[PDB]
Design a protein around this ligand. Structure first.
Ligand SMILES: [NH3+]C[C@H](O)c1ccc(O)c(O)c1
Ligand SMILES: [NH3+]C[C@H](O)c1ccc(O)c(O)c1
Ligand SMILES: [Cl-]
Ligand SMILES: [Cl-]
Ligand code: NA
Lengths: 562, 562
């Protein structure tokens, strides 16, 4: 196993994976559908929890076992099914991430013209629906159309007609055929990912140098414009308004936990592989703290700019903020182009913002795919040697499934699919991991490992969260998502029951595949039940200790100790 | 490598693969759309050609190299891409064969009731379309509906509504979701195939004992009824009527060649694997002659009974034979149920005919899948050991693609898909094979091998057909299918251009994959162009002869000899 060349390499890698498509793509609409500040109060709180130990924990794991995402479960081989589930999780994440990168690449190719397509409502690649969308500049009176949701704006019409072509699909039942422009964009994306991940992990770290600088500045520029917008105050006041009646709803906490675990990287195995490639004496404490702080600041400024753009669009279109924009994965493609058009020289800023999105999305996707490849290679040593022949199959499967997900009705599937799996999967994933580090491997042996690694023992609060706080909160949010599940629905389209059935089917598929491997390891071991349990709950390198009638997990001190 | 226990085992195996779903399923409608006797004159003629040497040839091949479908190309490793193409050919064949077996299993499950569904036109699992179908017994007057095609009959309505549910699909663009009844039937079929092919080839040979007896008798029974039908004479006269103006059409010859190569088994690698499992001293001459004669007699009697049923239905519904039934893979499910209903005790005869269809279809499918598994195992020795873990993946891929092909609009895809690939593929396949045995390996070395095997040298006519006649006819039919290609269309539905584009895409995919492996072997070899060509055109066991500057293919005597 090789390591990174310098600290800056994996530092900028984990930074670009922190400030990636995840935050700027999911936090805006997720905070928007939960009512601004009503989403901020739990999320941030949950943040610190799911930010401080767990991330750190994963890092320490990767720094101790020095294995892949699934192969680090050699201290407790029973709970290795989560290592195989996070692989499929990250695979789905890479699928819809590459779809989003293809969308952003199409936007970049379209924004090269001086007369930008989303500037007005005409036959300029926007594909107007029977001349229904009306420009704010052309209209000299109030909006007569129904204002429950505004899908007749230049940006939204260009997004849903010229890009996705959703008008040619009735729903998920009849999706259709993949668009050819999206097909070419996806081809370019998968080719870039392959040529970036075909040689090895040494390729990573060079491109991300342009990453750490480019989003922030652009985002900063948005803030420079954000306060200057005329109607931005109406969105800023709503973003900083705490709705306490919405904190009593389970959907807010579910979305907060999912967004945290999705943006931080916990539950995908990317952090595990990155720490496996890190040095043995690397300080995971400061890295985790800096990553959590950067994610918090980035999410805060992104939400601030998004609500400023929302207030501006509400003041322009004379609609309410609750209905001025649609809820879904396409919120940014509707909001940001308008704010760019407002600025002088909109072409340059649009190109810069789109290439920033492309860079961060490609970084996140290459990190996820590298994590998957590292896990499957450390699991199957045959795949570690055929580096250029194993990435090809993964990229081809990604290309096929993204073609399936870029149909006329793809936006109905992908998001839904994502959400469903992600939510359940991510929770279960970290839950399983926590349980191990809480109960089976132990919270004191993990602390001793961290002390051997970095020279100091973790704090008592960290161990309490590792053993009691974080696992209890994860079980709570799991039970909440199970009991208070709501039927998924798009902006206006309501999904049929079989779509939710397939989503829960994938969720239960992962949630049985973890105990599928549990039972597989239980049956593979030969001997009495006690001997099999001892072999399962003890590391492989200490399996001889099972033959010496010496087991620590059977002792009450192991479970009782903190 | 193991061999069959007795001669009867592989004899009945190749017989059941000869009289299988292929003949009774494809010859009826193919001869019906080509005008009866107008199809018989070329087909039978082409038969003897594509019947006598080629089949025999493949047998001898399997009896000499004793390898899989692709692995027998060790005497000429350059032309091994055809061995990899016939694998995908047989894979597609198994896919749509298992779809047809699921259809037949649904028919068997439905025919258990006393009041059979296709007996009349009512709400009895037939799903009538707005009461449009009219029973011949209920109607006391002539047919007022358009008679260009009769899709308003009980059998056809039950087939297209209660079984396929084609009314819920507009076309190939929006197929839909797999039916649950067809899903369960396909599950049962793939489970039977797995439990029949999980242990080994020794499982084959026991079930086929019930095969060799069951179709023929049933077919014989049909003949016993065939002459007794009142309007059967009008169909018998048309079947024995030679339309010379249709022999000048390319479609007739194309369909004849495709049906011959599809029913005999040439071009799938099943015969190669069966002969690889045969004894070394087995007489391939008599086996090939008996197989060709049995196929000819079975096709003749099947066409006779089919045209008798067509004449009866034309005399009953008062329509013409050219329009009394639809053209496609579902002709038998429309014709045979009516003839069974005409007989007393229709339930017993229906159950017997449906279980006969199930038996022959399962035999053909298990033969094809066993051929594929044997080829991929002899190619990859790792797959030969994991017998129970490699059949599972193939069966699961078959299950997935058959689910894809059993949608509401599956009948529009599957048949089309099949035809397209089959035609081009099968021609190219045998063509490549012929070329080898004609030019690269040689027709005299093959004769010497057959003499060493069975004790006698093949006749001069056989060698002439091996070298000149069969390859020339195959190149002719290939050029004919390429130049005179016609846009495919269903009974009434016309397929869009992209369906034919995908069909030709799969065809060209195989037709480049063969030279893809050619160029792969050319580039893999290191040395001068002459040395690489010598290594490519010489057997592996004689590769040392390349180092001795001794090559026979370079000599003019090898090409000139007959
Ligand atoms: N933050 C994005 C997340 O780490 C992720 C997960 C799976 C992926 O395939 C991917 O590209 C990114
Ligand atoms: N006659 C049937 C033919 O041999 C065939 C070809 C491919 C298959 O997958 C199959 O099941 C049967
Ligand atoms: Cl976040
Ligand atoms: Cl035939
Ligand atoms: Na993130």
């Amino acid at each position: 196993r090789e390591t990174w060349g310098k600290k800056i390499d994996f530092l900028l890698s984990v930074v670009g994976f922190a400030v990636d498509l995840a935050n700027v793509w999911r936090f805006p609409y997720l905070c928007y559908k939960n009512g601004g500040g009503a989403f901020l109060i739990p999320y941030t709180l949950f943040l610190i929890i799911a930010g401080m130990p767990l991330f750190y924990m994963e890092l320490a794991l990767g720094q101790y076992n020095r294995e892949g995402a699934a192969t680090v479960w050699k201290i407790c081989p029973f709970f290795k099914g989560v290592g195989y589930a996070v692989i499929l999780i990250a695979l789905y994440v890479g699928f819809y991430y590459n779809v989003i990168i293809a969308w952003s690449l199409y936007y970049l190719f379209s924004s090269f013209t001086l007369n930008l397509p989303w500037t007005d409502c005409g036959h300029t690649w926007n594909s107007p629906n029977c001349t229904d969308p009306k420009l704010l500049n052309g209209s000299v009176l109030g909006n007569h159309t129904k204002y429950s949701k505004y899908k007749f704006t230049p940006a939204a019409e260009f997004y849903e007609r010229g890009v996705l072509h959703l008008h040619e699909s009735s729903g998920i039942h009849d999706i259709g055929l993949p668009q050819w422009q999206l097909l070419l964009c996806l081809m370019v994306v998968v080719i870039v990912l392959y040529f970036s991940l075909w040689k090895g992990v040494k390729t990573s770290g060079k491109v991300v140098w342009i990453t750490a600088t480019l989003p922030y500045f652009v985002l900063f520029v948005l803030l420079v414009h954000g306060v200057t917008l005329p109607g931005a105050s109406n969105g800023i006041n709503a973003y900083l308004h705490i709705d306490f009646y919405r904190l009593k709803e389970a959907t807010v906490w579910i979305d907060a936990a999912t967004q945290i675990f999705f943006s931080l990287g916990a539950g995908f195995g990317v952090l595990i592989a990155f720490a496996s490639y890190n040095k043995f004496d690397n300080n995971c404490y400061r890295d985790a703290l800096l990553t959590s702080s950067i994610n918090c600041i980035t999410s805060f400024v992104s939400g601030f700019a998004i609500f400023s753009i929302l207030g501006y669009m509400a003041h322009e279109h004379k609609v309410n903020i609750e209905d001025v924009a649609t809820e879904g994965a396409g919120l940014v493609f509707i909001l940001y182009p308008e704010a760019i058009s407002t600025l002088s020289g909109s072409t340059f800023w649009a190109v810069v913002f789109f290439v920033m999105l492309l860079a961060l999305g490609l970084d996140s996707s290459m990190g996820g795919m590298e994590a998957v490849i590292t896990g499957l290679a450390d699991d199957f040593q045959v795949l570690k040697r055929h580096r250029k022949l194993f990435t090809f199959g993964v990229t081809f499967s990604t290309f096929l499934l993204a073609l399936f997900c870029i149909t006329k009705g793809g936006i109905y599937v992908l998001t839904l699919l994502d959400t469903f799996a992600a939510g359940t999967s991510i929770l279960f994933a970290v839950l399983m991991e926590a349980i191990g580090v809480s109960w089976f491997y132990g919270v004191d042996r993990f602390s001793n490992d961290i002390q051997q690694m970095m020279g100091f023992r973790p704090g008592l609060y960290w161990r309490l969260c590792w053993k009691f706080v974080s696992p209890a909160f994860l079980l709570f949010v799991v039970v909440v998502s199970i009991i208070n599940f709501k039927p998924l629905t798009y902006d206006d389209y309501i999904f049929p029951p079989w779509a939710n059935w397939v989503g829960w089917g994938i969720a239960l598929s992962s949630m049985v595949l973890v105990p599928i491997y549990v039972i597989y390891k239980f049956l593979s071991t030969q001997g009495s039940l006690w001997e099999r349990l001892a072999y399962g709950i003890t590391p492989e390198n200490e399996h001889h200790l099972v033959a010496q009638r010496d087991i620590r997990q059977f002792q009450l001190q192991h479970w009782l100790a903190i």
